[PDB]
Amino acid sequence: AEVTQLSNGIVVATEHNPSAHTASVGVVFGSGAANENPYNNGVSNLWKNIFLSKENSAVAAKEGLALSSNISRDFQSYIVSSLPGSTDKSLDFLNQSFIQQKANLLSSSNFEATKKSVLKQVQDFEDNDHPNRVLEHLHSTAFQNTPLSLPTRGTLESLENLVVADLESFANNHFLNSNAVVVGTGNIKHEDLVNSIESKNLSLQTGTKPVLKKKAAFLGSEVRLRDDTLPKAWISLAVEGEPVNSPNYFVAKLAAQIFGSYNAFEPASRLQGIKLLDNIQEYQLCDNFNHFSLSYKDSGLWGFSTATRNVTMIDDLIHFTLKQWNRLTISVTDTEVERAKSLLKLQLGQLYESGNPVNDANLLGAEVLIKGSKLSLGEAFKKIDAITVKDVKAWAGKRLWDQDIAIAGTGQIEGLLDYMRIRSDMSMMRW
């Protein structure tokens, strides 16, 4: 439970844990899909793919190292996992790929083979992963003509028109030192890693800063991807949520826990202490749903996603769900809040403390890049337990009550009513 972070020439962040069996090392840059353009959209995802290319991956496999990368909206990460003893050989492969081979990975035979793979990759996503496809379009319409609208995997049209030069241009503008953080998770000590880093000098493009842009903004709107050939309807609906480092960061996440997630086929899920379940189970309004409180640097999204085969009652699904959310402003109970606290801790714990260091790296990296530090799991619980019904009400009355929404859906959505009908349900009539 130690969050150590020091700065020499580069900012080093680590979180050591005795028993772990393995150690993960990697660099996390403060720029992701939110930094791209509509035309070079997908460059970051492309970088990730060559970094994991058969060539670069085989070089690490001989050495007994495993590679992992993750492209997000606000950040980007390249991670190498190793045994606690080879904590130095991971750094050799890291530097060898970001300075030495930052020209060998970009060969005309490797690039074309990779491009052909991310194309079949992004295509497969759009053709079959409907729930994530819908969630991606939700960001697209909610944050249209703004940084958060760009999809992480990039679009097919911007991808196929991408060249080696675009990779370089992005790398020379974002893979900078002032826009990076070296992260180490597993079991290795902070002093053990910082020494191996401060050993090898050479700045390489120091003092250089990444380009600036315009602030992200939420726009109440919708995108309907109707497709009657699909056997279900997948929808996602949300309001402007909370950005990371917001006073209500936790109040929002708790609010989403109150309604939680559901799976009609799992006996135990049908028994949860969620009032909404009394309404949706009678006629089986859906196969599943899940609420979320997505947070990013400039903004976020609070809402839910759902999947259903009850195509003639989608209006009841949306109506009952929105009536429940109305409650947060006027009648949420003490016990609902308390149930949420307990469940929020359990989920927040299971995330922050998993038996996998690669997840730890992403969580640590993403946090330190935005606030310059990481809030300890024990510190979070103190904030969570401090939330009162009055807090949730004040939050809901500002973020949910009579506020614009963003909608996205695909499949048999003929039954999903017009925007104004959904929007009207964001409140209730009163004397």
Partner 1 sequence: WGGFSVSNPTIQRFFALHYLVPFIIAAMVIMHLMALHIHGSSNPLGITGNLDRIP
In angstroms, the CA 177 to CA 180 distance is 5
Tokens of 394: 């004040």
Nearer to partner 1, 228 or 278 (CB): 228
Q: Select from ligand PCF, partner 1, none the partner in contact with residue 278, using the beta carbon and a kind-dependent cut-off of 5 to 8 Å.
A: none
Pull the structure tokens for residue 263. 């799976």
Q: What amino acid occupies position 234?
A: W
Q: Is the dihedral of CA 138, 140, 145, 148 positive or negative?
A: positive
The correct pick among 418, 429, 430, 431 for binding partner 1 (CB under 8 A) is: 418
313 binds partner 1 (CB under 8 A): no
Which one of the spans 92-100, 229-237, 327-335, 417-425 is the region binding partner 1 (CB under 8 A)?
A: 417-425
Q: Please give the angle made by the CA atoms of 258, 259 and 263, to the nearest 5 degrees.
A: 135
Q: How far is the CB of 137 from partner 1 (least distance, A)?
A: 21
Q: How many residues bind partner 1 (CB under 8 A)?
A: 3
What is the closest distance, in whole angstroms, from the C-beta atom of residue 228 to partner 1 in the complex?
A: 11
Number of residues near ligand PCF (by CB under 6 A): 2
Rounded CA separation 254/273 (Å): 14
Closest approach of ligand PCF to the CB of residue 402, in Å: 7
What residue has token string 């904030």? 383
**Contact call for residue 310 and ligand PCF (CB under 6 A):** no
Q: How far is CA 325 from CA 213, 257, 264, 273, 302, in A?
A: 35, 12, 20, 15, 11
- Of the listed pieces 62-70, 79-87, 97-105, 414-422, which binds partner 1 according to CB under 8 A? 414-422
CA dist 47 and 114 (Å) reads 10
Q: Is 424 in the site for ligand PCF (CB under 6 A)?
A: yes
403 binds ligand PCF (CB under 6 A): no
Write the interaction track for partner 1 spanning residues 370-409; mark x where CB under 8 A is met and - where it is not: ----------------------------------------
Using CB distances below 5 to 8 A depending on partner kind, what does residue 209 bind out of ligand PCF, partner 1, none?
none
- Opening angle at CA 106, ends 100 and 108, nearest 5: 140
Residue closest to ligand PCF (Cβ): 424
Cβ of residue 174: shortest distance to ligand PCF, in angstroms?
A: 45
Q: Which of 313, 389, 417, 428 binds partner 1 (CB under 8 A)?
A: 417
Q: Which is nearer to ligand PCF, 106 or 428 (CB)?
A: 428
Asked if 223 is part of the footprint of partner 1 (rule: CB under 8 A), the reply reads: no
Contacts 24+ apart (CB under 8 A), 203-208: 203/9, 203/177, 204/99, 204/177, 205/172, 205/176, 205/177, 206/9, 206/177, 206/178, 207/178, 208/176, 208/177, 208/178
Residue 362 · residue 74 · CB < 8 Å? no
Mutual angle of helices 377-385 and 334-352, in 10-degree steps: 170
Partner from ligand PCF, partner 1, none binding residue 424, C-beta < 5-8 Å depending on class: ligand PCF
| Residues of the shown chain interacting with ligand PCF in the complex, contacts defined by CB under 6 A | 424, 427
Binding site for partner 1 (CB under 8 A): 417-418, 421
